[PDB]
Amino acid sequence: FTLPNLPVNNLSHSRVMEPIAQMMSSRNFPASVQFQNGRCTLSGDLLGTTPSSPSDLGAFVGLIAEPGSRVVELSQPNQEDFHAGSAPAPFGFPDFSDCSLTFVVASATTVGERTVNARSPQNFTPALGHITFDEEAPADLFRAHLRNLWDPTEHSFWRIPDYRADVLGSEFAPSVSAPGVGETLLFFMCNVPRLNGANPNPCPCLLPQEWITHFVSERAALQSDVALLNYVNPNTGRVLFEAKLYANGFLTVNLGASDQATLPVDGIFKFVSWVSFYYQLRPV
Amino acid sequence: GSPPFTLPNLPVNNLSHSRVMEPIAQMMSSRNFPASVQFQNGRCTLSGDLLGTTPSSPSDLGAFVGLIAEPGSRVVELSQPNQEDFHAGSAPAPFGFPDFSDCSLTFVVASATTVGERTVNARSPQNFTPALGHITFDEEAPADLFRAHLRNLWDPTEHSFWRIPDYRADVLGSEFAPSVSAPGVGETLLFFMCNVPRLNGANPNPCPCLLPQEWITHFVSERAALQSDVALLNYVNPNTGRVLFEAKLYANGFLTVNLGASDQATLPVDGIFKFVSWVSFYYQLRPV
Ligand SMILES: [Zn+2]
Ligand SMILES: [Zn+2]
Ligand SMILES: [Zn+2]
Ligand SMILES: [Zn+2]
Ligand SMILES: [Zn+2]
Ligand SMILES: [Zn+2]
Ligand SMILES: [Zn+2]
Ligand SMILES: [Zn+2]
């Protein structure tokens, strides 16, 4: 079993297309999260809306329902049809809430911005295969990229929106929490552009995109439920701290007596050995 | 101690473009494509040596970090996309900076206080000077430090994605990624394609690149030793295991195919490239 031999500050975020800027763990972070993007088992099984093609992250493909409408019918980001009820949303669709989403929108004839209100039950219904922009949709087939958040809150990057679908369905990526005693989830962080509202940043994710991609490529056999990792200084080889990588695709650390930790991103995670659920991590 | 050479086990339609942050949509080769190209992004040796402006962080592709030179100015001083200083002459441009020409480049720009659009005229010798460590927007720069990512091209041409711009620097300099052409007789370069947003002018699409981003990333991680200058590859149907065609993967980071009697080919992207064997420059490819 292996990880890519790359420093964290060369890795990319997995819920938005941005480089990973920070690494954080905290007892004041939510104990459980249910991100739909950036979700993959160590054996390379993608979960939720995690796109098979990484560049589809935060993107979608839409077509106006009828001339002059604000309503767009959703496809998969590879222009293949989106089957309603098959998933919370088309693959790569943003899993943010408590805000409006402003997308850059590009068709054969136009480039501009459109905004969808994720607070609106009427407009935000991706599981049904269509959403309603705040403005009139472009006349033709377009590709959209998430550009910024409008009027977000502190909860925007931590709580998934109402997809107009039951979150306990098998099509959803399941909730994640640190199972080990005293353990807390390790999050990869970046900042996302936003206008008005309150500061949503930082944006957390469980896994780097490169790790997810690697897992899918390797399809490694797991000899245990938990992989032990050392965070190592690439120049000296010295260990800064150890973490456990659980089979369902997340990292935890032992904060020990501490309630918080902001970790340097110039190190490299290395696979040490296979350990068990009960392995007790040395405090950060 | 160097590991053997390997490729990621992923179909092409799950791979990402390496000159713009887009999924690879098509795979094409043609005798009517330019015989040589000198892309500065998406350049990497099989042993994991990055070339040109190819960013160590993939998310920096088509991005840059800038600061306005003085209050009210259109001129922005360029940094590296991780804010380390950009020393002029070290490279054609800061890492990840777009290598497109014959157009204007419209970026989405985000600072602590603003999100908007800024445009640089790449046809302008005075305004497009990234090698000197600054460029001049069409509009007044944001008041504070910003990050920009490529949004669309304005008024491009058919050559926009094929010819690199004038960085205001000697393109034969050692800091440039060298020109690339199919070395074998009758061979043509295999290009990975996607579409890029554009307004007005003439259609520049599709946008070519030599290597998938994931391959480049994989090469950097592995730092593999090569047993020869050329790796033979089979493009295989992952479901059935059958070979669709074979291609040559050269050490300096590009693929070629034999189109045979054909002058053009658009190839399916649902297959997977598999490492076959080590061959030489003179290996003769079975026609696609
Ligand atoms: Zn279908
Ligand atoms: Zn519908
Ligand atoms: Zn796009
Ligand atoms: Zn400590
Ligand atoms: Zn410096
Ligand atoms: Zn604007
Ligand atoms: Zn011409
Ligand atoms: Zn890999």
Coordinates of C-alpha atoms and ligand atoms in Angstrom, one line a residue:
Chain A
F1 CA 0.0 0.0 0.0
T2 CA 1.3 3.4 -1.0
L3 CA 0.7 7.2 -1.0
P4 CA 1.9 9.6 -3.6
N5 CA 5.4 10.9 -2.7
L6 CA 4.3 14.6 -2.8
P7 CA 4.3 17.4 -0.2
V8 CA 0.9 18.5 1.0
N9 CA 1.5 22.0 -0.4
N10 CA 1.7 20.5 -3.8
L11 CA -1.6 18.7 -3.5
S12 CA -5.1 19.8 -4.5
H13 CA -8.3 20.2 -2.5
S14 CA -11.1 17.7 -3.1
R15 CA -14.3 19.7 -2.6
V16 CA -13.1 22.7 -4.6
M17 CA -10.5 23.1 -7.3
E18 CA -7.9 24.9 -5.2
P19 CA -4.4 24.0 -3.8
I20 CA -4.4 22.8 -0.2
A21 CA -3.1 25.7 1.8
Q22 CA -3.5 24.5 5.4
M23 CA -3.9 21.4 7.5
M24 CA -6.1 21.5 10.7
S25 CA -7.7 19.4 13.4
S26 CA -9.8 20.7 16.3
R27 CA -12.1 19.5 19.1
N28 CA -14.4 22.5 18.2
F29 CA -14.8 21.3 14.6
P30 CA -18.1 19.4 14.0
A31 CA -17.7 15.8 15.3
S32 CA -19.3 14.4 12.2
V33 CA -19.4 15.5 8.6
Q34 CA -21.1 14.1 5.5
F35 CA -19.2 15.7 2.6
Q36 CA -20.4 14.3 -0.8
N37 CA -17.3 15.3 -2.7
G38 CA -13.7 14.3 -1.8
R39 CA -15.0 10.9 -0.7
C40 CA -13.2 7.6 -1.5
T41 CA -12.3 4.4 0.2
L42 CA -8.7 3.3 0.4
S43 CA -9.6 0.5 -2.0
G44 CA -10.6 3.1 -4.5
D45 CA -14.3 3.1 -4.2
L46 CA -15.7 6.6 -4.9
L47 CA -18.7 7.7 -2.8
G48 CA -21.4 10.3 -3.1
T49 CA -20.9 12.9 -5.8
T50 CA -17.1 12.5 -6.0
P51 CA -16.4 12.9 -9.7
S52 CA -14.5 10.2 -11.6
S53 CA -12.8 13.0 -13.5
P54 CA -11.2 15.4 -11.0
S55 CA -11.6 18.5 -13.2
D56 CA -15.4 18.1 -12.9
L57 CA -15.1 19.1 -9.3
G58 CA -17.3 22.1 -8.7
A59 CA -18.5 22.0 -12.3
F60 CA -21.7 20.9 -14.0
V61 CA -23.3 20.9 -17.4
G62 CA -26.8 22.4 -18.0
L63 CA -29.3 23.2 -20.6
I64 CA -32.2 25.7 -20.4
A65 CA -35.5 23.9 -20.0
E66 CA -37.3 26.1 -22.5
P67 CA -36.7 29.5 -24.2
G68 CA -36.3 32.4 -21.6
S69 CA -36.4 30.1 -18.6
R70 CA -34.3 30.4 -15.4
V71 CA -34.6 26.6 -15.0
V72 CA -31.8 24.4 -16.4
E73 CA -31.9 20.6 -17.0
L74 CA -28.7 19.0 -15.6
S75 CA -26.5 16.6 -17.3
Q76 CA -23.4 14.8 -16.1
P77 CA -20.3 17.0 -16.4
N78 CA -19.2 14.8 -19.4
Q79 CA -22.4 15.9 -21.2
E80 CA -23.9 12.4 -20.7
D81 CA -27.4 12.3 -19.4
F82 CA -28.1 12.7 -15.6
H83 CA -30.5 10.1 -14.3
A84 CA -32.8 11.7 -11.7
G85 CA -33.0 9.8 -8.4
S86 CA -29.7 8.0 -9.1
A87 CA -27.6 10.4 -7.0
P88 CA -27.8 13.4 -4.7
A89 CA -26.6 15.5 -7.7
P90 CA -24.6 15.0 -10.9
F91 CA -21.0 14.1 -10.2
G92 CA -18.7 16.9 -9.0
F93 CA -21.6 19.2 -8.1
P94 CA -20.8 21.4 -5.1
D95 CA -21.8 20.1 -1.6
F96 CA -22.1 23.6 0.0
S97 CA -25.0 25.1 1.8
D98 CA -26.3 28.2 3.6
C99 CA -25.4 30.4 0.7
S100 CA -25.9 31.1 -3.0
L101 CA -23.5 29.6 -5.6
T102 CA -22.1 31.9 -8.3
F103 CA -20.9 30.0 -11.3
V104 CA -18.9 31.1 -14.3
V105 CA -21.0 29.9 -17.3
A106 CA -19.7 29.2 -20.8
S107 CA -21.5 28.1 -23.9
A108 CA -20.6 28.1 -27.6
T109 CA -22.0 31.7 -27.8
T110 CA -21.6 33.2 -24.3
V111 CA -19.4 33.5 -21.2
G112 CA -20.8 35.0 -18.0
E113 CA -22.0 34.3 -14.5
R114 CA -25.2 32.7 -13.1
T115 CA -26.2 32.2 -9.5
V116 CA -28.2 29.5 -7.8
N117 CA -29.8 30.0 -4.3
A118 CA -28.9 26.8 -2.3
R119 CA -31.2 28.1 0.5
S120 CA -34.2 27.8 -1.9
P121 CA -36.1 24.5 -1.8
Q122 CA -37.8 25.7 -5.0
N123 CA -34.7 26.5 -7.0
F124 CA -32.1 24.0 -5.5
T125 CA -33.3 20.6 -6.5
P126 CA -30.3 18.9 -8.1
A127 CA -31.4 15.3 -7.2
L128 CA -34.4 15.8 -9.5
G129 CA -32.0 16.8 -12.3
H130 CA -32.7 20.5 -12.6
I131 CA -32.0 23.8 -10.8
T132 CA -33.2 27.4 -11.1
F133 CA -30.8 30.3 -11.5
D134 CA -31.4 33.7 -10.0
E135 CA -31.2 35.0 -13.6
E136 CA -32.4 33.8 -17.0
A137 CA -30.3 30.9 -18.2
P138 CA -28.1 31.0 -21.3
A139 CA -29.9 29.9 -24.5
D140 CA -27.7 26.9 -25.2
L141 CA -25.7 24.1 -23.6
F142 CA -23.2 25.4 -21.2
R143 CA -20.5 24.2 -18.8
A144 CA -20.3 25.9 -15.4
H145 CA -17.5 26.3 -12.9
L146 CA -18.0 27.4 -9.2
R147 CA -16.4 30.8 -8.9
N148 CA -17.5 32.1 -5.5
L149 CA -20.0 31.9 -2.7
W150 CA -22.7 34.6 -2.2
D151 CA -24.0 35.4 1.2
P152 CA -22.5 32.4 3.0
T153 CA -22.3 31.5 6.7
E154 CA -19.8 29.8 9.0
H155 CA -21.7 26.6 8.4
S156 CA -21.5 26.7 4.6
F157 CA -18.5 24.4 4.1
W158 CA -19.5 22.1 7.0
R159 CA -23.2 21.3 6.2
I160 CA -24.3 19.7 3.0
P161 CA -27.3 21.4 1.3
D162 CA -30.8 19.9 0.9
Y163 CA -30.5 18.0 -2.4
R164 CA -34.2 17.3 -2.4
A165 CA -33.2 13.7 -1.4
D166 CA -33.0 11.4 1.6
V167 CA -29.5 11.7 3.0
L168 CA -29.6 8.2 4.4
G169 CA -30.0 6.7 0.9
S170 CA -27.3 4.4 -0.4
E171 CA -26.5 7.0 -3.1
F172 CA -25.1 9.3 -0.4
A173 CA -21.6 9.2 1.0
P174 CA -22.2 8.2 4.7
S175 CA -21.4 10.5 7.6
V176 CA -17.8 10.4 9.0
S177 CA -16.5 10.9 12.5
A178 CA -13.3 10.0 14.4
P179 CA -14.0 6.5 15.8
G180 CA -10.9 6.1 18.0
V181 CA -11.0 7.4 21.6
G182 CA -9.8 11.0 21.9
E183 CA -9.2 11.2 18.2
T184 CA -10.2 14.0 15.9
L185 CA -10.6 14.2 12.1
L186 CA -7.6 15.7 10.2
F187 CA -8.8 18.3 7.6
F188 CA -7.2 19.7 4.5
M189 CA -8.0 23.4 4.2
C190 CA -8.1 26.1 1.6
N191 CA -9.9 29.5 1.2
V192 CA -12.7 30.1 -1.2
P193 CA -13.7 33.4 -2.8
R194 CA -16.9 34.9 -1.3
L195 CA -19.1 38.0 -1.4
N196 CA -21.2 39.4 1.5
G197 CA -22.6 37.3 4.4
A198 CA -20.2 35.9 7.0
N199 CA -16.8 34.3 6.5
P200 CA -17.2 30.6 5.5
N201 CA -13.5 29.9 5.3
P202 CA -11.6 27.7 5.7
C203 CA -13.0 25.0 3.5
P204 CA -12.3 21.4 4.8
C205 CA -12.0 18.1 3.0
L206 CA -11.1 14.6 4.1
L207 CA -8.6 13.6 1.4
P208 CA -6.4 15.2 -1.2
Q209 CA -7.5 14.8 -4.8
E210 CA -4.2 13.1 -5.6
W211 CA -4.7 10.5 -2.9
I212 CA -8.2 9.7 -4.2
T213 CA -6.9 9.4 -7.7
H214 CA -4.1 7.1 -6.5
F215 CA -6.5 4.9 -4.6
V216 CA -8.7 4.4 -7.7
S217 CA -5.6 3.6 -9.8
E218 CA -4.0 1.2 -7.4
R219 CA -7.1 -0.6 -6.0
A220 CA -4.8 -1.8 -3.3
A221 CA -5.9 -4.7 -1.0
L222 CA -6.2 -3.6 2.6
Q223 CA -4.6 -5.8 5.2
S224 CA -6.3 -3.9 7.9
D225 CA -9.1 -1.4 8.6
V226 CA -6.5 1.2 9.5
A227 CA -3.3 2.4 7.8
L228 CA -0.7 4.0 10.1
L229 CA 1.0 7.1 8.7
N230 CA 4.0 9.2 9.5
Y231 CA 4.1 12.9 8.5
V232 CA 7.7 13.3 7.6
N233 CA 10.1 16.2 6.7
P234 CA 11.2 15.4 3.2
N235 CA 14.6 17.1 3.7
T236 CA 15.6 15.4 7.0
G237 CA 13.3 12.3 7.1
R238 CA 12.3 13.2 10.6
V239 CA 8.7 12.5 11.9
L240 CA 6.6 15.5 12.9
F241 CA 3.6 13.5 13.9
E242 CA 1.7 10.2 13.2
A243 CA -1.8 9.8 12.0
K244 CA -4.2 6.9 11.2
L245 CA -5.8 6.5 7.8
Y246 CA -9.1 4.6 8.1
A247 CA -10.4 2.3 5.3
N248 CA -13.4 4.5 4.5
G249 CA -11.2 7.4 3.5
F250 CA -10.3 9.9 6.3
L251 CA -7.5 10.7 8.6
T252 CA -7.5 11.2 12.4
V253 CA -5.0 12.5 14.8
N254 CA -4.5 12.6 18.6
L255 CA -4.6 16.2 19.8
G256 CA -3.8 14.8 23.3
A257 CA -4.2 17.6 25.9
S258 CA -4.7 20.1 23.1
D259 CA -8.0 21.2 21.7
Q260 CA -6.6 22.4 18.3
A261 CA -3.7 22.0 15.9
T262 CA -2.6 23.8 12.7
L263 CA -0.1 21.6 11.0
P264 CA 2.7 22.5 8.5
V265 CA 2.0 21.5 4.9
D266 CA 5.6 21.1 3.6
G267 CA 5.8 17.5 4.8
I268 CA 4.9 14.2 3.2
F269 CA 2.6 11.4 4.5
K270 CA 4.2 8.0 4.4
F271 CA 2.6 4.6 4.9
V272 CA 4.2 2.9 7.9
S273 CA 2.2 -0.3 8.6
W274 CA -1.2 -1.8 9.0
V275 CA -2.6 -1.4 12.5
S276 CA -5.9 -1.9 14.2
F277 CA -8.9 0.2 15.2
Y278 CA -7.6 0.4 18.7
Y279 CA -4.1 1.7 17.9
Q280 CA -3.4 4.7 20.1
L281 CA -1.8 7.7 18.3
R282 CA 1.0 9.7 20.0
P283 CA -0.3 13.2 20.6
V284 CA 0.4 15.9 18.0
Chain B
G1 CA 16.7 2.3 -5.5
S2 CA 14.6 3.8 -8.3
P3 CA 11.2 2.1 -8.9
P4 CA 10.2 0.6 -12.2
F5 CA 8.3 2.8 -14.7
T6 CA 4.5 2.7 -14.3
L7 CA 1.4 4.5 -15.5
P8 CA -1.8 5.3 -13.5
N9 CA -4.5 2.7 -14.0
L10 CA -7.1 5.2 -15.2
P11 CA -9.2 5.6 -18.4
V12 CA -8.4 8.8 -20.5
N13 CA -11.9 10.2 -19.9
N14 CA -11.1 10.3 -16.2
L15 CA -7.9 12.2 -16.7
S16 CA -7.3 15.9 -16.6
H17 CA -5.9 18.3 -19.2
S18 CA -2.4 19.7 -18.5
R19 CA -2.5 23.2 -20.1
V20 CA -5.9 24.1 -18.7
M21 CA -7.9 22.9 -15.7
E22 CA -10.5 20.9 -17.7
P23 CA -11.3 17.2 -18.1
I24 CA -9.8 15.5 -21.2
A25 CA -12.7 15.2 -23.7
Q26 CA -10.9 13.9 -26.8
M27 CA -7.8 12.2 -28.1
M28 CA -6.5 13.3 -31.6
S29 CA -3.6 12.9 -34.0
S30 CA -3.3 14.5 -37.4
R31 CA -0.8 15.0 -40.2
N32 CA -2.3 18.5 -40.7
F33 CA -1.6 19.5 -37.1
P34 CA 1.6 21.5 -36.6
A35 CA 4.7 19.2 -36.9
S36 CA 6.3 20.9 -33.9
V37 CA 5.0 22.5 -30.7
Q38 CA 6.6 24.2 -27.8
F39 CA 4.0 24.2 -25.0
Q40 CA 5.4 25.5 -21.7
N41 CA 2.7 23.8 -19.5
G42 CA 2.0 20.1 -19.4
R43 CA 5.7 19.4 -19.8
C44 CA 7.4 16.6 -17.9
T45 CA 10.0 13.9 -18.5
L46 CA 9.0 10.3 -17.6
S47 CA 11.5 10.4 -14.8
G48 CA 9.5 13.2 -13.2
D49 CA 11.5 16.3 -14.2
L50 CA 9.1 19.3 -14.7
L51 CA 9.8 21.6 -17.7
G52 CA 8.9 25.1 -18.7
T53 CA 6.2 26.7 -16.5
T54 CA 4.6 23.3 -15.5
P55 CA 3.4 23.9 -11.9
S56 CA 4.4 21.7 -9.0
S57 CA 0.8 22.2 -7.7
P58 CA -1.7 21.1 -10.4
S59 CA -4.3 23.6 -9.1
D60 CA -2.0 26.4 -10.1
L61 CA -2.5 25.6 -13.8
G62 CA -3.8 28.6 -15.6
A63 CA -3.5 30.6 -12.4
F64 CA -1.3 33.3 -11.0
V65 CA -0.8 35.6 -8.0
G66 CA -0.4 39.3 -8.5
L67 CA -0.2 42.6 -6.7
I68 CA -0.9 46.1 -8.2
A69 CA 2.3 48.0 -8.8
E70 CA 0.9 51.3 -7.4
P71 CA -2.5 52.8 -6.5
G72 CA -4.8 53.0 -9.5
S73 CA -2.4 51.2 -11.8
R74 CA -3.2 48.6 -14.4
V75 CA 0.2 47.0 -13.8
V76 CA 0.4 44.0 -11.5
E77 CA 3.7 42.6 -10.1
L78 CA 3.7 38.8 -10.6
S79 CA 4.5 36.3 -7.8
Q80 CA 4.7 32.6 -7.9
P81 CA 1.2 31.1 -7.3
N82 CA 2.4 30.2 -3.8
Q83 CA 3.5 33.8 -3.2
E84 CA 7.3 33.0 -3.2
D85 CA 9.2 35.6 -5.2
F86 CA 9.4 35.3 -9.0
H87 CA 12.9 36.0 -10.3
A88 CA 12.9 37.1 -13.9
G89 CA 14.9 35.0 -16.4
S90 CA 14.4 31.9 -14.3
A91 CA 11.4 30.9 -16.5
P92 CA 9.2 32.2 -19.3
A93 CA 6.6 33.1 -16.7
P94 CA 5.6 32.2 -13.1
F95 CA 4.7 28.5 -12.8
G96 CA 1.3 27.5 -14.1
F97 CA 0.9 30.7 -16.2
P98 CA -1.1 30.0 -19.4
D99 CA 0.9 29.5 -22.6
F100 CA -1.7 30.7 -25.1
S101 CA -1.3 33.4 -27.7
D102 CA -3.0 35.4 -30.4
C103 CA -5.8 36.5 -28.1
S104 CA -6.7 38.3 -24.9
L105 CA -6.8 36.3 -21.6
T106 CA -9.8 36.9 -19.3
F107 CA -9.1 35.8 -15.7
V108 CA -11.4 35.5 -12.7
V109 CA -9.8 37.6 -10.1
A110 CA -10.3 37.2 -6.3
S111 CA -8.9 39.2 -3.5
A112 CA -9.9 39.6 0.2
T113 CA -12.2 42.4 -0.8
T114 CA -13.2 41.7 -4.5
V115 CA -14.2 39.1 -7.1
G116 CA -14.3 40.1 -10.7
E117 CA -12.7 39.9 -14.1
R118 CA -9.4 41.2 -15.5
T119 CA -8.0 40.8 -19.0
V120 CA -4.5 40.9 -20.5
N121 CA -3.9 41.4 -24.2
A122 CA -1.5 38.7 -25.1
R123 CA -1.0 40.3 -28.6
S124 CA 0.4 43.4 -26.8
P125 CA 4.2 43.5 -26.4
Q126 CA 4.0 46.2 -23.8
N127 CA 1.2 44.7 -21.7
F128 CA 2.1 41.0 -21.9
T129 CA 5.5 40.8 -20.3
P130 CA 5.4 37.9 -17.7
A131 CA 9.1 37.1 -18.1
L132 CA 9.8 40.5 -16.7
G133 CA 7.6 39.7 -13.7
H134 CA 4.7 41.9 -14.4
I135 CA 1.7 42.2 -16.8
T136 CA -0.7 45.1 -17.7
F137 CA -4.4 44.5 -17.4
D138 CA -6.9 46.2 -19.8
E139 CA -8.5 47.5 -16.6
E140 CA -7.3 48.9 -13.3
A141 CA -6.0 46.2 -11.0
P142 CA -7.7 45.3 -7.7
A143 CA -6.3 47.4 -4.8
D144 CA -5.0 44.3 -3.0
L145 CA -3.2 41.0 -3.4
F146 CA -5.3 38.7 -5.6
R147 CA -5.4 35.2 -7.1
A148 CA -6.5 34.8 -10.7
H149 CA -7.6 31.8 -12.7
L150 CA -8.2 31.6 -16.4
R151 CA -11.8 32.1 -17.3
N152 CA -12.0 32.5 -21.1
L153 CA -10.2 33.7 -24.2
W154 CA -11.2 36.9 -25.9
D155 CA -10.9 37.4 -29.7
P156 CA -8.7 34.3 -30.3
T157 CA -7.5 32.7 -33.5
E158 CA -7.1 29.1 -34.7
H159 CA -3.4 29.3 -33.7
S160 CA -4.2 30.4 -30.1
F161 CA -3.7 27.0 -28.5
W162 CA -0.9 25.9 -30.8
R163 CA 1.5 28.8 -30.7
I164 CA 3.0 30.0 -27.4
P165 CA 3.0 33.7 -26.8
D166 CA 5.9 36.1 -26.7
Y167 CA 6.9 36.1 -23.1
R168 CA 9.4 38.8 -23.9
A169 CA 12.2 36.3 -23.5
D170 CA 14.4 34.2 -25.8
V171 CA 12.5 31.0 -26.5
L172 CA 15.7 29.0 -27.1
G173 CA 16.8 29.8 -23.5
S174 CA 17.4 27.0 -21.1
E175 CA 14.5 28.1 -19.0
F176 CA 12.1 27.2 -21.8
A177 CA 10.6 23.8 -22.4
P178 CA 12.1 22.7 -25.8
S179 CA 10.2 22.2 -29.0
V180 CA 8.6 18.8 -29.5
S181 CA 8.0 16.8 -32.7
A182 CA 7.3 13.2 -33.6
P183 CA 10.9 11.7 -34.1
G184 CA 9.9 8.4 -35.8
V185 CA 9.4 8.3 -39.6
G186 CA 5.7 8.7 -40.4
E187 CA 4.9 9.2 -36.8
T188 CA 2.6 12.0 -35.5
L189 CA 2.1 13.4 -32.0
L190 CA -0.9 12.1 -30.0
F191 CA -2.7 15.0 -28.4
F192 CA -5.2 15.1 -25.5
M193 CA -8.0 17.5 -26.2
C194 CA -10.6 19.6 -24.4
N195 CA -12.6 22.7 -25.1
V196 CA -11.9 26.1 -23.6
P197 CA -14.4 29.0 -23.2
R198 CA -13.9 31.8 -25.7
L199 CA -15.7 35.0 -26.8
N200 CA -15.6 36.4 -30.4
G201 CA -12.7 36.0 -32.8
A202 CA -12.3 32.6 -34.4
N203 CA -12.6 29.1 -32.9
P204 CA -9.4 28.1 -31.2
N205 CA -10.7 24.7 -30.0
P206 CA -9.8 22.0 -29.4
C207 CA -7.0 22.7 -27.0
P208 CA -4.1 20.2 -27.2
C209 CA -1.6 19.0 -24.6
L210 CA 1.1 16.3 -24.6
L211 CA 0.5 14.6 -21.2
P212 CA -2.4 14.1 -18.8
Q213 CA -2.0 15.9 -15.5
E214 CA -2.3 12.6 -13.6
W215 CA 0.6 11.2 -15.6
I216 CA 2.8 14.2 -14.8
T217 CA 1.9 14.0 -11.1
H218 CA 2.6 10.3 -11.1
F219 CA 6.0 10.8 -12.8
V220 CA 7.0 13.4 -10.1
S221 CA 6.0 11.1 -7.3
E222 CA 7.7 8.0 -8.7
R223 CA 10.9 9.5 -10.2
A224 CA 11.2 6.2 -12.1
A225 CA 14.3 5.0 -13.9
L226 CA 13.9 4.2 -17.7
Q227 CA 15.5 1.1 -19.3
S228 CA 15.3 2.9 -22.6
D229 CA 14.5 6.2 -24.3
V230 CA 11.1 5.0 -25.5
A231 CA 8.3 3.2 -23.7
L232 CA 5.9 1.2 -25.8
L233 CA 2.2 1.5 -24.8
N234 CA -1.0 -0.4 -25.6
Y235 CA -4.3 1.4 -25.5
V236 CA -6.5 -1.3 -24.1
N237 CA -10.3 -1.8 -23.4
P238 CA -10.4 -2.1 -19.6
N239 CA -13.5 -4.3 -19.7
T240 CA -12.3 -6.9 -22.3
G241 CA -8.5 -6.5 -22.1
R242 CA -8.2 -6.2 -25.9
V243 CA -5.7 -3.9 -27.5
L244 CA -7.2 -1.0 -29.6
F245 CA -3.8 0.4 -30.8
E246 CA -0.2 0.9 -29.7
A247 CA 1.7 4.1 -29.1
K248 CA 5.2 5.3 -28.2
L249 CA 5.9 7.2 -25.0
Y250 CA 9.2 9.1 -25.4
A251 CA 11.4 9.9 -22.4
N252 CA 11.0 13.7 -22.6
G253 CA 7.3 13.4 -22.2
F254 CA 5.1 13.0 -25.3
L255 CA 3.2 10.3 -27.2
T256 CA 3.3 9.4 -30.9
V257 CA 1.2 7.1 -33.1
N258 CA 1.3 5.7 -36.6
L259 CA -1.7 7.0 -38.5
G260 CA -0.6 4.8 -41.5
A261 CA -2.5 5.6 -44.6
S262 CA -4.7 8.1 -42.7
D263 CA -4.0 11.8 -42.2
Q264 CA -6.3 12.1 -39.3
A265 CA -7.8 10.2 -36.3
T266 CA -10.1 10.9 -33.4
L267 CA -9.6 8.2 -30.8
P268 CA -12.0 6.9 -28.1
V269 CA -11.2 8.0 -24.5
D270 CA -12.7 5.1 -22.6
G271 CA -9.5 3.0 -22.8
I272 CA -6.4 2.7 -20.7
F273 CA -2.8 3.1 -21.7
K274 CA -0.7 0.1 -20.5
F275 CA 3.0 -0.1 -20.2
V276 CA 4.2 -2.7 -22.8
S277 CA 8.0 -2.8 -23.2
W278 CA 11.1 -0.7 -23.6
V279 CA 11.9 0.0 -27.2
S280 CA 14.1 2.4 -29.3
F281 CA 13.6 5.5 -31.4
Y282 CA 13.5 3.2 -34.4
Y283 CA 10.7 0.9 -33.3
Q284 CA 8.1 0.9 -36.0
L285 CA 4.5 1.3 -34.8
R286 CA 1.6 -0.8 -36.1
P287 CA -0.8 1.7 -37.8
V288 CA -3.7 2.8 -35.6
Ligands
ZN1 ZN -28.4 7.8 -19.4
ZN2 ZN -35.8 18.2 -14.9
ZN3 ZN -14.6 25.4 -18.2
ZN4 ZN 2.7 19.2 19.4
ZN5 ZN 12.7 35.5 -4.2
ZN6 ZN -17.7 41.5 -14.3
ZN7 ZN -3.9 32.2 -39.4
ZN8 ZN 0.1 7.4 -8.5

